[PDB]
Symmetry: C2
Amino acid sequence: LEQNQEIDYSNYPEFSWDTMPLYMHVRKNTAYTDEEINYLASFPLITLEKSQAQNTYGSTEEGTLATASAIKLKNNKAKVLYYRNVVINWGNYKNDDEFISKNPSALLKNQNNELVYMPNGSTPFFDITKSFVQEYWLKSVEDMVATPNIDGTFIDANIKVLVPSFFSSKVGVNKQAEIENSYFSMMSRLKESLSNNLILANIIRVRPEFEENGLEYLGYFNGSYLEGFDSEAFGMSNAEYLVEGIEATQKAAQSGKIITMTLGLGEAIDNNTGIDDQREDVDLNDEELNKRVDYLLAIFLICAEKYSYVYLHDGYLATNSAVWLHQFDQYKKALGAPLGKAIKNGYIYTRKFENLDVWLNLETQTATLTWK
Amino acid sequence: IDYSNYPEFSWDTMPLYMHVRKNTAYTDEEINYLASFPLITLEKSQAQNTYGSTEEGTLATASAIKLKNNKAKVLYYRNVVINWGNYKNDDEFISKNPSALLKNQNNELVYMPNGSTPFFDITKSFVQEYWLKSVEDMVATPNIDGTFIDANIKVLVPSFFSSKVGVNKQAEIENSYFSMMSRLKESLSNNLILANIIRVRPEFEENGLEYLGYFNGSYLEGFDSEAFGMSNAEYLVEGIEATQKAAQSGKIITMTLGLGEAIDNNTGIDDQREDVDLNDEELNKRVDYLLAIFLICAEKYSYVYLHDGYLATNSAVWLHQFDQYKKALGAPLGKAIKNGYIYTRKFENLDVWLNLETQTATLTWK
């Protein structure tokens, strides 16, 4: 497996321990307002998702360029990443639509010559085993990253390539191995061509198939995004699953890799409204909600090192998120640099920072943040 | 009550409903499966990637179903306010008439939670006429027996639109909706109109019965999904009471209940989706429970669907028949009896015992 490169922080985002280090990961179907641009520009690291303002700019490619230009004019130090899925042919990319229309052989088929799909039955996959698909995809990423207001790329669906059953159950064992081989070739190409830029990947993940829960695959990347971090599977308890995720994240962060930890608040915010009635306004000062914020931040702080950033989210679509444009009080309070590593005692973790003491219990799913 | 356009019904075995879409044409086996149900709703996005549009995919599917079983009743889905994709005729109409879409007081489009799907402004006469004709034209085709009208409750719960377009516009949407439903009641009097209307709601003192006079029956969803601070059991008690009254009055009931949560196995996102054992003891207990809720309510022309979503290619129960669907049921020998949260009912070949509090039921088949 690809080894990690020697650490060079030249192109890394800004980072401070003074207050919570925050990540943003976002789309909107139309252009951001000026106020929204100012909000985005306040984050040190921003990923622009697929379906980026396409109903204003006609395409994600153009909506990305316009959004990134506006962010950079407000804060030229904000780092902006372009999302790219390595295998799923999601909609709203004008260049992808043209490429697939002109070249139907670019899509992935099973051994019976049938197109295979995501669970919606309509979104297909790129057959990255084909040279011309690899070249198209790599060029699309390199061309976008080369533009002035884009600093790097967020690579998605690595785990769909690397967990053998995902594609072997669709296209067979040999084709899965071929997809994997081509994936490694493509990531090696980006590691070299984007060496003066940033590459983040959705890669660290508790998986029975991954002996090191994704750390073994970080060699191509400046860091990992984390999702599914508190969503247990494989018969593991919630606490057991988080213990493994925390260990992997601590190791990656201590190695100097960027970490962008996403944790959902959707379940703590939902109040059984919004489907056939107005969605009830969320009291973002609610005491129980803030206990959940404390808990999720405590998980993050037990792991964090320099270049670790957190996003407690209500989905990535700005217009459907109750936390969009908002900042919890925990994000404004003095944090300060760690005074050492977390201490683990069973499912209880503690950590001291210059202005904060953290206590976390994974079994009870509770935490305390004692600000100084 | 005029039953002349109603579907077939038998108590001999479980009366079943089907509610379905697929992005491409059904296979022959799938058409035979559809044709075996007495009442089928064809959803939006109906084979549009084979036939080019939902309109033509609906026509093709319905023709094939009726060739296999001409007695099957087939309904065309139509949303009264949401402009969902894949209707070629809607795309043409909206492109030509952007003013057909609902805007707020700043003249901005308003959307569903996805931020992209807009709404028909049904306060405008030309929109009303386009919509009504689209329904009437499709129901007049030979292989379609009626329509399934969706999103009634989004019109009738004031906060849904008032929070988007203002209180005056919501009242006007509601007024126009009633005019449109009165028109359809008359034009489709030789056909079937099923609506997504019975629903426990604080705004509806009769939980949707007060609107049922426009329609030949109701589809039910959200039926076991409590809200408003209500307990699950008391929320179901209210839905059961509404459904019993409707069914006993001769209205069609199509009760949908999700098995998604009892089938979900924490796989299929980044790995292969593991088989759910459809013969499992635990899944069969859940089927028994959900069928018991249905049977406590059912009358002639009540039908049930225990589902894993409406997209055929993503459903673990597509093409499947639970054993509970094959056993002799027989006619009810009395209405359900309610003793607290425990209901019982006797049929010729089955005794039902249902406890809403524990979410368990016992089906004693003879």
